[PDB]
């Protein structure tokens, strides 16, 4: 393989998904230049688990997945193995045995708008925790008591999603961060993604 992996499409994407509806790009049959990502001085977070970040260009994997979404600054710590909280429990969950890297950068200049950017959403209500790499896009009214809701937002009956409302004057912890999660999968199948 001589074609480069389309990591540009993921990291430089025009728009990013809401975390509850996180995007997944399946990357295969390509050569990846991972040192380009790690040599970049433009990332706030670059944490890898089960792989050393530098000595990564001479590894081959069956599939590489690139998940991407926007969360709060204060919530980036939840995109890690073994974490709990609103985002890890109800929006995007990494497995305990995660093999991959978590990459984040402040996107206040792109994803906040004056008076509030209500495009980006997170799930506030869910009965049970997500399994690793589970994506829940349902919009059913959340039942917090014994009586059914049937589509109306009232007492004990909550719309499950809420808006971040990113305003450019937000404190850093409330500012938007774009996140890319690279997971590396090694199955008993031909390895389609190698580095060079």
């Amino acid at each position, epitope marked *: 393989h001589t074609n480069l992996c389309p990591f540009g499409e993921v990291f430089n994407a025009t728009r990013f998904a809401s975390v509850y509806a996180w995007n997944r790009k399946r990357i295969s049959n390509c050569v990846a230049d991972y040192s380009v990502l790690y040599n970049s001085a433009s990332f706030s977070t670059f944490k890898c688990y089960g792989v050393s970040p530098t000595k990564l260009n001479d590894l081959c994997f069956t599939n590489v997945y690139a998940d991407s979404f926007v969360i709060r600054g204060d919530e980036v710590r939840q995109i890690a193995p073994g974490q709990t909280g609103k985002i890890a429990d109800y929006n995007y969950k990494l497995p305990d045995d995660f093999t991959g890297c978590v990459i984040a950068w402040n996107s206040n200049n792109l994803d906040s708008k004056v008076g509030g950017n209500y495009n980006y959403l997170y799930r506030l209500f869910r009965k049970s*925790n997500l399994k690793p790499f589970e994506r829940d896009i349902s919009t059913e009214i959340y039942q*917090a008591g014994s009586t059914p809701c049937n589509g109306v937002e009232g007492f004990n009956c909550y719309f499950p999603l809420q808006s971040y409302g*990113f305003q450019p004057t937000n404190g850093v912890g409330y500012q938007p961060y774009r996140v890319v999660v690279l997971s590396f999968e090694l199955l008993h199948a031909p390895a389609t993604v190698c580095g060079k």
Partner: antibody
Amino acid sequence: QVQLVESGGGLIQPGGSLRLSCAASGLTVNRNYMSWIRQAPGKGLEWVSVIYSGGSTFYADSVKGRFTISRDNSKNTLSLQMNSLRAEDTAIYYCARDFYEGSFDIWGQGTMVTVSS
Amino acid sequence: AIQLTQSPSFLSASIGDRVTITCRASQGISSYLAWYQQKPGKAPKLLIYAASTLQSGVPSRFSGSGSGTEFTLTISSLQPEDFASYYCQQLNSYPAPVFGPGTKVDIKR
């Protein structure tokens, strides 16, 4: 008839233990963000602990390792186990339901906890 | 972490007065604020959440406003049951909820 009712407070020596309970009606404890909040005499509110519907629990730094929040689904109750109590834990303890990012709409009447030698 | 101030700490008012209480956040917190009322010996009572949404069952004379760092609670026409203390709360806060130091509204004479 929505209400929360705390119980189990009382007078205890430093180092002792108390277990608070909170009986809910009109909301399901294990489907809500349920918190304990306390208020020392003459002071303001201090959040103590929360349990998420999905089961995650979190604690104020000042009580971490000493208090444990739990719930009983069959009795629709919430509990707070308080070990290694200190004089500064003296407060009225409220249970409350969090319906939006910390907005507590339903409060119990509170139960008084007094820690003193 | 973010800190909340409240102004003024004490306010004297008469029945029928327009009353405005202010809460300041040390950094921008958008509309992540709630307001409570509390009287001696009683649990707090939620008045406003999301900076401006009136909690159901709260009289319409209560309103909140502001976004970012400056927030106000307004009582358009003060009623006898409104003499009380009032607290703001930073919502969706890390690592823990933060409460303002309060405003006590007493009876002017």
